[PDB]
Amino acid sequence: PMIRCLRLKVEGALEQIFTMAGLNIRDLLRDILRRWRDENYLGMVEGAGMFIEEIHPEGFSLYVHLDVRAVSLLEAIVQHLTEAIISSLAVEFDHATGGERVHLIDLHFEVLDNLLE
Amino acid sequence: DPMIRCLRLKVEGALEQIFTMAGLNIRDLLRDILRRWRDENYLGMVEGAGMFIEEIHPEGFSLYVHLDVRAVSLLEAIVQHLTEAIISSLAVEFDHATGGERVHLIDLHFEVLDNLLE
């Protein structure tokens, strides 16, 4: 396998913004990723998992486990995943608030080291 | 079908400092223990795995191992193997580096993060 992990930080204040709009951003991310996993499985990624680790006093780290079909595909994989997350959160937020905006375009993944390479 | 998990092992800052004072780099030792497991073909337990380290502030770090553990009983077997392998190997390294001193390692354990996409 060719295994990578991505990490994205969700600010505690971002999570609260979503909460106040009546949204659970963790549940939304899970839905976005499930959908993205299903819409790519057997394609560029043979497997995908999602882990959440608390940040204290608030916020969380979102980890995405990926088994990629080839290393050179990572850039396009990360690009498409990032776009799906930002666009999908933006749509939900718009709908929950009657058209308010929230700053999301800084959401971005780091490709973590894989020391078992 | 896959059972993707993340195993997280916390290393206290004081434990890291204990190894540093023995002239040992515990992060590199842990890296090498996991690479030897890999180089044994993971003893067949998994087809592959990823590994990274995150800092703890102000001191210490967590080691992360993420892989398809296949099944619950196999997960338990992987965790038991890695934990024993880490504890025994670090103890040998520490013993050698210090001329036979001991260090308390039996609290080292992995917590398991669930795949939230399941």
Query: Sheet holding B49-55: strands in order across?
Result: B49-55, B61-68, B4-11, B110-113
Look up residue A22 and give its two tokens. Answer: 């009546």
A113 touches chain B (CB under 8 A): yes
Q: Tell whether B29 lies on the interface with A, counting CB pairs under 8 A.
A: no
> Determination technique for this PDB entry?
X-ray
Among B69, B113, B116, the strongest candidate for a mutation testing the A interface, having the largest count of A CBs within 10 A, is B116
CB contact under 8 A, B38 and A116: yes
| Structure-token pair, residue B112 | 């398991």
Contact (Cβ atoms closer than 8 angstroms) between residue A50 and residue B116: yes
Token pair listed for B65: 């191992």
Q: Which domain holds residue B60?
A: 1-118
* Region of A59 on the Ramachandran plot (φ > 0 left; ψ -120 to 50 alpha; else beta): left
Please, which residues bridge with residue B15 across strands? none
Burial class (CB in 10 A: 0-12, 13-18, 19+), A72: exposed
Strands (DSSP E) contained in chain B are 4-11, 49-55, 61-68, 110-113
Distance of CA B117 to the CA centre of its chain: 25
- Alpha helix segments (H runs only) across A1-117: 12-20, 25-38, 74-97
Q: Do A5 and B66 touch (CB under 8 A)?
A: yes
At B98, phi and psi to the nearest 5? -110, 0
Identity of the amino acid at A60:
F
Resolution of the deposited coordinates, in angstroms? 2.1
Name the 3-class secondary structure at A85. helix
CA distance B49 to B55: 20
Which amino acid is located at A59 in the chain? Answer: G
* Cα-based distances in Å from B11 to A6, A8, B3, B92: 22, 23, 26, 18
> Could you tell me the CATH number of the domain that includes residue A82?
3.30.70.2870
In angstroms, rounded to a whole number, what is the distance separating the alpha carbons of residues A74 and A80? 10
Q: What's the domain count of chain A? A: 1
Q: What is the DSSP letter of A48?
A: E
Residue with tokens 């991505």: A6
**DSSP secondary structure, A61-73, as one string:** EEEEEEEES-GGG
Name the minimum distance, in Å, from the CA of B98 to any CA of chain A: 28
Taking the CB of residue A85, how many other CB atoms lie within 10 A of it? 22
What is the C-alpha separation between A28 and A60, in angstroms, rounded?
14
Whole-angstrom Cα distance, residue B29 to residue B116?
Answer: 31
Long-range contacts at A70-75 (CB < 8 A, ≥ 24 apart): A70/A2, A71/A2, A73/A44, A74/A4, A74/A111
Place of tokens 């940040």: A55
Asked if residue B45 lies in contact with residue B78, where contact means CB atoms within 8 angstroms, the answer is yes
Can you tell me the distance from the alpha carbon of B84 to that of B109, in angstroms, rounded to the nearest whole number? 9
CA angle B32–B34–B35, rounded 5-degree value: 60
- Residue B50: which of A34, A37, A116 has the nearest Cβ? A116
Q: Any chain B CB within 8 A of the CB of A8?
A: no
In total, chain B counts a number of residues equal to 118
Question: Is residue B35 within 8 angstroms of chain A, CB to CB?
Answer: yes
Q: How many Cα atoms are found within 13 Å in the side-chain-facing hemisphere of B42?
A: 18
Q: Which of A77, A46, A47, A62 is nearest to A9 (CA)?
A: A62
